[PDB]
């Protein structure tokens, strides 16, 4: 058997990216061998979270009684080479016919990133095949006419950008540097930032697209000569680590660093030697949501051909996996449950049985998905008309001397003061 696939009465696609590789030129039309590339522990954790969720539901005699959920899951280290997995989810018996109005899957969870979603979503949108993303935060996916069957269980970039602005406005500094990943996620972030501060005291004094060619020596030289103290770094794990590691090596000091939620809970950087030297790190963070039972599931899982379904991660420390950045955990959990509930309601399941042999079209799943209204771990799972989530909080953290991301504030989407911060918890310099 395999972690990546599970037979069931109905199938859910899982689109993950367990390995990382930078894009490169290719001269053949074929999938990429991701199993040989850089392993990513927290993405792998999120992958397990989906496996955990499905098994939890299959264990339940209440949700989907006597109806098993299976999955086909993928490790797409490359968005441009992800299409074989995507085709498999949409095919009738390993065949696609383009002009069709019984697909292998009833919906899909993922993908994690905006680049992955932009590359493949039109193929799902055409037949209103439902996608529930646990990570994609692009502004553009809130345009329902462009992405009619796209939903997500994390907030749009606009909300995180608002929280970041609230962090800046709580303090006295008004010149800001904005370092962003040279990708769709990063560019959209810069755009929202620029839009949000235009009518405020905040001045964007410097900004730069981050990639492998960044002259960090020169970037930090300029930042220093403009006497800029606040540096927003809006970037995924790989880019954020490049920035902060370069900052340590170039003896950047006395800065105030502000992280987006994709690296405020990073687990490598708070323990890196010298991290202290570059100043103070704050960030917007997803609060830690405890998923009961997950710990036991991981211990159990670690104790254990189609492309992009191979982990090559034998002999992982169970400890390291448990302790990995837990951001996006509830987004994954809630995404699986939303599809489960949608299926349950589409089948017209009662409290202890389901009408059987019923053929389900993905578009029927969609209608129930958009009408989602259920409780999960004392949160209420709903989506607005744009497919954006109406659940999930944002907090402010401070990386404190023992290496923890200590909560020091809460971001309120509605409140008169949008951002509270207990400033005495923050130990500067």
């Amino acid at each position, epitope marked *: 058997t395999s972690e990546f696939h599970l037979r069931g009465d109905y199938l859910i696609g899982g689109l993950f990216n367990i390995h990382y590789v930078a894009a490169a030129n290719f001269q053949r039309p074929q999938a990429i061998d991701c199993s040989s590339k850089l392993f990513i522990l927290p993405n792998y954790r999120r992958f397990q979270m989906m496996r955990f969720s499905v098994e939890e539901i299959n264990n339940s005699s209440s949700l989907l009684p006597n109806v098993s959920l299976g999955y086909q899951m993928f490790d797409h280290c490359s968005d441009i080479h992800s299409f074989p997995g995507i085709f498999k989810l949409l095919s009738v018996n390993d065949l696609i016919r383009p002009w069709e109005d019984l697909p292998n899957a009833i919906g899909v969870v993922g993908p994690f990133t905006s680049t992955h979603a932009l590359s493949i979503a039109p193929i799902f949108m055409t037949n209103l095949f439902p996608m529930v993303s646990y990570g994609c935060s692009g502004s553009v996916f809130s345009k329902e006419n462009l992405y009619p069957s796209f939903l997500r269980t994390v907030h749009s970039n606009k909300d995180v950008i608002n929280a970041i602005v609230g962090i800046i*406005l709580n303090f006295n500094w008004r010149w800001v540097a904005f370092l962003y990943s040279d990708d769709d996620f990063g560019k959209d972030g810069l755009e929202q930032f620029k839009n949000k501060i235009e009518d405020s005291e905040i*001045c964007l004094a410097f900004y730069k697209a981050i990639n492998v060619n960044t002259d960090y020596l020169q970037v930090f030289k300029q930042i220093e000569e403009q006497n800029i103290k606040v540096i927003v770094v809006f970037a995924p794990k790989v880019y954020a680590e490049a920035v902060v590691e370069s900052a340590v090596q170039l003896n950047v000091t006395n800065k105030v660093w502000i992280a987006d939620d994709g690296w405020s809970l990073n687990k490598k950087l708070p323990s890196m030697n010298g991290i202290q030297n570059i100043g103070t790190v704050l960030g917007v963070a997803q609060p830690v949501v405890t998923i009961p039972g997950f710990t036991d599931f991981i211990y159990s899982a670690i104790s254990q051909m189609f492309c992009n379904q191979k982990c090559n991660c034998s002999n992982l420390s169970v400890k390291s996996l448990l302790n990995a950045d837990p951001s996006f955990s509830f987004p994954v959990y809630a995404a699986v449950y939303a599809i489960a509930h949608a299926l349950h309601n589409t089948l017209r399941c009662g409290s202890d049985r389901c009408p059987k042999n019923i053929t389900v079209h993905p578009h029927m799943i969609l209608e129930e998905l958009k009408k989602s209204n259920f409780t999960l771990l004392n949160q209420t799972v709903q989506f607005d008309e744009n497919g954006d989530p109406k659940f999930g909080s944002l907090s402010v953290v401070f990386w404190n001397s023992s290496g923890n991301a200590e909560e020091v504030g809460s971001y309120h989407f509605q409140s008169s003061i949008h951002l509270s911060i207990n400033k005495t918890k923050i130990k500067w310099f």
Partner: antibody
Amino acid sequence: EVQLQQSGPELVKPGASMKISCKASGYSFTGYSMNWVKQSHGKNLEWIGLINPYNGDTTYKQKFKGKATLTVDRSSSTAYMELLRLTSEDSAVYYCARSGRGAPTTTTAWFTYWGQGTLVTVSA
Amino acid sequence: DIVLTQSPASLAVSLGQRATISCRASESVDSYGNSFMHWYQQKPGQPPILLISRASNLESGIPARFSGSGSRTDFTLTINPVEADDFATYYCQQTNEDPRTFGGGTKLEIKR
């Protein structure tokens, strides 16, 4: 365009308190500090303090601590300054004034927009 | 607290001629690569108007006959040529350091 519109002149009793309003329009209210300035008839300008309308944080010049109280009402985009325990030396023209854009800190911002001024006469 | 001293206290300058107004600070008002000294015009009964920020930056809408110069502790506002509506009190203001302080002002008179 930006307008700062202050409440009208006010005759107030010695020992009493009074509240000046500064109604801000034409821009995003919580984005900029609102300053207050005192001008005695001698004509010196004196900075009283500022308020961050985003979170309510205040900074005062020492001599106005416990003498002036800056607040904001975010739902009406109005900044308020309350003057306590009025004496004839509180007789003056009082201005609200918005911080501009381009300074490196809230502290260094200059004043680009001014209310029209509020004349306070402390007399029995 | 930074003390700003303006000179002269009062000034009479003919139309078409140049007015020069000094402001001296007790301590440097430089930081962040800038000089945080600003100049304001105040006509009687009117709010002050910002003419020049950061020693030399002419504000939008302000006529080009107004210019500023200087650094550290010594600053100059220049009005050239002076015109008939330029009579006012001119104030300097430092914002380098809490609390913000103003100069006692310079009253410019039109000579005729």
